[PDB]
Amino acid sequence: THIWYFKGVPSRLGYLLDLAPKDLEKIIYFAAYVITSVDEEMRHNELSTLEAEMAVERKAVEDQRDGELEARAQKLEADLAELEAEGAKADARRKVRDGGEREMRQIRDRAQRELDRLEDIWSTFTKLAPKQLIVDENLYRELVDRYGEYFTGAMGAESIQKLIENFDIDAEAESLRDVIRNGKGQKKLRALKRLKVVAAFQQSGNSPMGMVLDAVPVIPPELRPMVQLDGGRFATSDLNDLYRRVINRNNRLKRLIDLGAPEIIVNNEKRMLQESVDALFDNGRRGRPVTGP
């Protein structure tokens, strides 16, 4: 992505894609996934079947937790009866009873952990739509595992590219015009700004896809003159240094993807590449500027 946009004030991407800067930067630097497209009508046809499948699975976790609770409660009751038979002091009775009660509380709370996770999964499944965000990777991992069928969501610049190219401008422009036709100044000003940006896009005759680059150019060599000192040292404009960094990192990416490796390293490496390109198009725009000497 082009540093001049996801960091600019106003951030053209934020207005066009109606995303907060926090979410956009998390998406760009590979922090939190995004949901691209969802065949909502296809999910709707079996929404009842999905809910039934939910009922049976949640009843299954209910049955396992109930069995565990029954087993542990019977064990504690048997232990208390044994202690009474031995005629031990009430201190031992309360120690064992508190231990067992805390064990059962922990068991029930873990059951509740599973149940609340399941309802979170559902909630996020049913009320699911584009432009939504999932901060935690584990929950998304879970979603794609249990239901990896309907919604396809990836992380990185290509995610934004697919979202925008799949996105349409005229419909949003009409909706914003309709909102403006109404009142409610508070939201009306935001609608006005977004409509201005979208109308500029539409009138330009271009497409937003220009905000995601695949081929940066390089200026001629003379513009970045190369200088030889008494010892022939390289002390010319660092433009050569920045291009060195970008090219080197791209070649590392290519070699690594050729060799094969898990997602973590590849994603980290892509983040590093994005950082370098942002630095080259501008140093010090955001974050610590690079400093060699």
């Binding site: 039934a52 009922a55 049976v56 009843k59």
Partner: protein, 49 residues
Amino acid sequence: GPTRDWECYCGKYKRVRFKGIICERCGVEVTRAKVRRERMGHIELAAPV
């Protein structure tokens, strides 16, 4: 429909977790007893009336 609720004639799918499933062994559907109240039958005539 079934005389009882969530009960196949033959007992093959008597468990609660079956809705919309017609039992091939007995050829009946599994839904609450209420559905018995809202389904009809038509007799076929051999001579118009």
